[PDB]
Amino acid sequence: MIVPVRCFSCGKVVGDKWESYLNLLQEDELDEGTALSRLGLKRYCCRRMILTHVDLIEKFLRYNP
Amino acid sequence: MSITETFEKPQRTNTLRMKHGTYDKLDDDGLIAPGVRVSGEDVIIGKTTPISSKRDASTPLRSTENGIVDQVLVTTNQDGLKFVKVRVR
């Protein structure tokens, strides 16, 4: 649904970096890998956490009821 | 003929036909409302039936299940019958 608050494996707070990841892509035109690394996410467990998320709430928000 | 069913709170009358559940969660319209927590064998849809005064015809929650009422819908069939759909989260 939305950015999980912590990384499942280590608990490192990650649910406060979704918007930043997005801007680092559109506005700064950086690549995914180079982006996650600039967000302090070094261990593949945390990296996958954001890189693999699917923000379905956007489509959910698109309903009226 | 004149033998309908009614969604409401049954509390025994000349028949005493009910179930080992607990109708303490149904509103007067004979339906729990969203937000209410249901478990055990609670009654989700209390209904009665006069056979030719009160004979229980209520739908209790599944046994090994327990959650919270996520939604209740009251519609009409193609013929005209009253329909009820209770989604439990």
Next chain:
Amino acid sequence: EEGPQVKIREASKDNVDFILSNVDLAMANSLRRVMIAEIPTLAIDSVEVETNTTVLADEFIAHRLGLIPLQSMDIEQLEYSRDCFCEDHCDKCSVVLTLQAFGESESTTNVYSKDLVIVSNLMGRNIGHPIIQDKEGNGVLICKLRKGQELKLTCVAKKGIAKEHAKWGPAAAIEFEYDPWNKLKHTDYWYEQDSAKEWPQSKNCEYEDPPNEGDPFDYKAQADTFYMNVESVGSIPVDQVVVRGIDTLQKKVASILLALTQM
């Protein structure tokens, strides 16, 4: 000061890369476990949902709330709710917060952890403040609302430990290594053609003396000198995690001498 030996390499508000020396692996490992699961902390452990028209379910939001890092500086000056002599909760053992958000604008309304409001008396102790570390002061993104959607909650923070639930855990990850050079031979390397060539050399190999060809296996050398690196989640200062960890373990060991006493 004789005994364990700290030798910090790096230090910051998030990590403590150091080098424990002159200690038993057991102690090193015990501390590693305590930091991960037994350091007291405050975290949402009850949520009253008044209004929720959001796209998310209550338990879904509730779940996330409890995962929101909360200031636990003076966590020791907050009694465990299970001990507190009151009925349920009170300012002596719990911090109450509220979340009210409405979809006003047309653009999606974001509900962050900053929007949380403490409604209980903190009595001057640094505790209950939602931790924030993003360059925007928003913190953790709890939910999102469409124009018209509402969300009115009431959270009750409580002191807890990771053992009961990971949310109460102050630590994030804990690097742990020793004997970067497999001199002790605690591990048997897997290989195809060359053990050394195929296995990446560790950072700590630099901080140590490479074994010498001729020297026969040193069968007496034990496991001391561990290269750690703690990482705080924010609810508690990095150095604190360690210190308090060392202290907590110290308490347990003591709770036993006291048991022998009253035994």
Next chain:
Amino acid sequence: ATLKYICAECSSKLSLSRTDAVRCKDCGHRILLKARTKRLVQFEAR
């Protein structure tokens, strides 16, 4: 005050008993939703 039932589409709060048919005002839809109770629900943030 109060809001027994809610409409599926127009979301306009309704409230009627028997013989009152099963429609809503203005919108001829025949759906209606139960509307969340007032009794506040508590949750384990676990």
Next chain:
Amino acid sequence: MNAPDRFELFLLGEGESKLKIDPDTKAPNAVVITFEKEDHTLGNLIRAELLNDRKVLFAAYKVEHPFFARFKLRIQTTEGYDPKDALKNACNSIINKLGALKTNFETEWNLQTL
């Protein structure tokens, strides 16, 4: 539903004590202490220390089943040497060892610039 509460992992239930000491029959000067509401953190710790003591003939610990939070500590010592004393010596030696580490850390933490 069948799963036990989480607090049971560290909270003593009614009718429970932190320590259960019993005399080992398989050997002399031996004891089997049952630590309730504790795991590998303490078991392997006090265990490793009891081993540094030379007047200790035997020391091992084991958690019979991961479902429950408790472990058994068996100790054997030379005649005259009470096993309950080796546990005391070990505990104290730990508390001291840890205390020193807490000090050495809060010190090195000061000499840091960040």
